[PDB]
Design an enzyme around this catalytic site. Sequence first.
Site, mmCIF file in Angstrom:
data_model
loop_
_atom_site.group_PDB
_atom_site.id
_atom_site.type_symbol
_atom_site.label_atom_id
_atom_site.label_comp_id
_atom_site.label_asym_id
_atom_site.label_seq_id
_atom_site.Cartn_x
_atom_site.Cartn_y
_atom_site.Cartn_z
ATOM 1 N N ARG A 54 3.681 35.334 -27.710
ATOM 2 C CA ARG A 54 4.945 36.034 -27.355
ATOM 3 C C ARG A 54 4.893 36.484 -25.893
ATOM 4 N NH1 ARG A 54 5.036 39.216 -31.088
ATOM 5 N NH2 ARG A 54 6.781 38.428 -32.337
ATOM 6 N N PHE A 59 8.516 42.582 -19.234
ATOM 7 C CA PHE A 59 8.077 43.394 -20.398
ATOM 8 C C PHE A 59 6.562 43.263 -20.587
ATOM 9 C CE2 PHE A 59 8.639 44.360 -25.222
ATOM 10 C CZ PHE A 59 7.916 45.515 -25.050
ATOM 11 N N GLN A 62 1.850 38.809 -24.847
ATOM 12 C CA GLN A 62 1.136 39.157 -26.074
ATOM 13 C C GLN A 62 0.323 37.964 -26.564
ATOM 14 O OE1 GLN A 62 3.713 40.451 -29.190
ATOM 15 N NE2 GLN A 62 2.095 40.874 -30.685
ATOM 16 N N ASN A 101 0.564 46.204 -32.961
ATOM 17 C CA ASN A 101 0.398 46.621 -34.348
ATOM 18 C C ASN A 101 1.650 46.353 -35.175
ATOM 19 O OD1 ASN A 101 2.122 49.090 -34.255
ATOM 20 N ND2 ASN A 101 0.513 49.859 -32.880
ATOM 21 N N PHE A 112 -1.495 43.122 -25.975
ATOM 22 C CA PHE A 112 -0.558 42.729 -24.947
ATOM 23 C C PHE A 112 -0.924 43.315 -23.603
ATOM 24 C CE2 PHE A 112 2.054 46.643 -24.778
ATOM 25 C CZ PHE A 112 1.726 47.235 -25.983
ATOM 26 N N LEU A 121 6.430 52.908 -25.777
ATOM 27 C CA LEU A 121 5.315 52.618 -26.660
ATOM 28 C C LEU A 121 4.243 53.736 -26.741
ATOM 29 C CD1 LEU A 121 4.940 48.865 -25.647
ATOM 30 C CD2 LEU A 121 6.345 49.870 -27.448
ATOM 31 N N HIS A 125 1.210 52.679 -29.668
ATOM 32 C CA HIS A 125 0.235 51.616 -29.448
ATOM 33 C C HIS A 125 -0.917 52.159 -28.667
ATOM 34 C CE1 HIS A 125 2.900 48.321 -30.771
ATOM 35 N NE2 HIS A 125 3.840 49.237 -30.505
HETATM 36 C C1 LIG Z 1 -0.157 43.986 -40.698
HETATM 37 C C2 LIG Z 1 -0.707 42.632 -41.181
HETATM 38 N N1 LIG Z 1 -1.953 42.262 -40.469
HETATM 39 C C3 LIG Z 1 -1.846 41.237 -39.417
HETATM 40 C C4 LIG Z 1 -1.406 41.912 -38.138
HETATM 41 C C5 LIG Z 1 -0.219 41.447 -37.581
HETATM 42 C C6 LIG Z 1 0.294 42.033 -36.427
HETATM 43 C C7 LIG Z 1 -0.380 43.092 -35.813
HETATM 44 C C8 LIG Z 1 -1.575 43.570 -36.365
HETATM 45 C C9 LIG Z 1 -2.091 42.996 -37.536
HETATM 46 N N2 LIG Z 1 -3.259 43.585 -38.079
HETATM 47 C C10 LIG Z 1 -4.443 42.838 -38.525
HETATM 48 C C11 LIG Z 1 -4.429 42.485 -40.022
HETATM 49 C C12 LIG Z 1 -3.152 42.862 -40.756
HETATM 50 O O1 LIG Z 1 -3.225 43.739 -41.615
HETATM 51 O O2 LIG Z 1 0.301 43.449 -34.680
HETATM 52 C C13 LIG Z 1 1.551 42.743 -34.696
HETATM 53 O O3 LIG Z 1 1.391 41.718 -35.697
HETATM 54 O O1 LIG Z 2 3.927 41.684 -32.659
HETATM 55 C C1 LIG Z 2 4.787 42.333 -33.196
HETATM 56 O O2 LIG Z 2 5.267 41.993 -34.401
HETATM 57 C C2 LIG Z 2 5.345 43.537 -32.505
HETATM 58 N N1 LIG Z 2 4.905 43.632 -31.102
HETATM 59 C C3 LIG Z 2 5.515 42.991 -30.086
HETATM 60 O O3 LIG Z 2 6.447 42.221 -30.174
HETATM 61 C C4 LIG Z 2 4.849 43.366 -28.778
HETATM 62 C C5 LIG Z 2 5.805 44.252 -27.889
HETATM 63 C C6 LIG Z 2 6.557 45.327 -28.754
HETATM 64 C C7 LIG Z 2 5.445 46.351 -29.119
HETATM 65 C C8 LIG Z 2 4.139 45.708 -28.525
HETATM 66 C C9 LIG Z 2 4.744 45.165 -27.182
HETATM 67 C C10 LIG Z 2 3.719 44.340 -29.205
HETATM 68 C C11 LIG Z 2 3.869 44.404 -30.714
HETATM 69 O O4 LIG Z 2 3.154 45.056 -31.439
#
Ligand SMILES: CCN1Cc2cc3c(cc2NCCC1=O)OCO3
Ligand SMILES: O=C(O)CN1C(=O)[C@@H]2[C@@H]3CC[C@@H](C3)[C@@H]2C1=O
Length: 164
Positions: A54, A59, A62, A101, A112, A121, A125
Site C-alpha cells: 500500500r 501520506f 506500507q 495495526n 509504514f 495516528l 499506532h
Molecule cells: C488482525 C489480523 N492479523 C493480521 C494483521 C493484519 C494487519 C495488521 C496487523 C495484523 N496483525 C498480525 C496478525 C493478525 O492478528 O495491520 C494492518 O493489517
Molecule cells: O493496513 C491497514 O488495514 C490499515 N493501515 C493503513 O492503511 C496504513 C495507513 C492508515 C493507518 C496506518 C497508515 C497503516 C494501517 O494500519
Amino acid sequence: GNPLVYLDVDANGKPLGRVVLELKADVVPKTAENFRALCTGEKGFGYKGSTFHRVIPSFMCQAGDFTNHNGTGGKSIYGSRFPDENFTLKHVGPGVLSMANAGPNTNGSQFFICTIKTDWLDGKHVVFGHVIEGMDVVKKIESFGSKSGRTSKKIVITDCGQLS
Ligand SMILES: CCN1Cc2cc3c(cc2NCCC1=O)OCO3
Ligand SMILES: O=C(O)CN1C(=O)[C@@H]2[C@@H]3CC[C@@H](C3)[C@@H]2C1=O
C-alpha cells in the site's frame, strides 16, 4: 544503543536504493526488536522478498505483509500479534517509522514509513523509529503509489539486514 537496519528496495526488478532506519530500542524495545529480527531473518522468516503493498502519495508507504502480501497478513517474532508497547513517540513528520495495526494490540509485522506528518495516528499506532538515510528512496517508492494505495509497479524488499 539503538540498532541501525536497512531495506534495499526495487521496482519491477530495478533497484531504487537503500533505506536506513534507526530503531528506537531506548523507547520501545519489544517493538524495535521485532522489526530488527524481521530484517535479519534470524527467526527463519522476515521481510526479505516481501513487498510494499500500500503506497499513498502525500501520506505513507506500507509494507511487511510477508505471509499474505495483501495487507491482511504478517506476524511478529513473538507470535501472531503483540500489544501496543507505548505511544511515547509521535508521528512528527516525514520519515517516521510506525506499526500498522487492525486496532488496539494487533501489532504483527506490517509497518509504514510516513511521507508527511501523520499526527492523527498519534496514540493509535506505535512509532518505533525513523529514516536515517535514503529518504529519496522512500520518495521513489511513493511515486509508484496512488491515492487508492494500489502501486503501479511491484515494489519489493530484495534484501534487508542490520548495520549495527
Ligand atoms: C488482525 C489480523 N492479523 C493480521 C494483521 C493484519 C494487519 C495488521 C496487523 C495484523 N496483525 C498480525 C496478525 C493478525 O492478528 O495491520 C494492518 O493489517
Ligand atoms: O493496513 C491497514 O488495514 C490499515 N493501515 C493503513 O492503511 C496504513 C495507513 C492508515 C493507518 C496506518 C497508515 C497503516 C494501517 O494500519
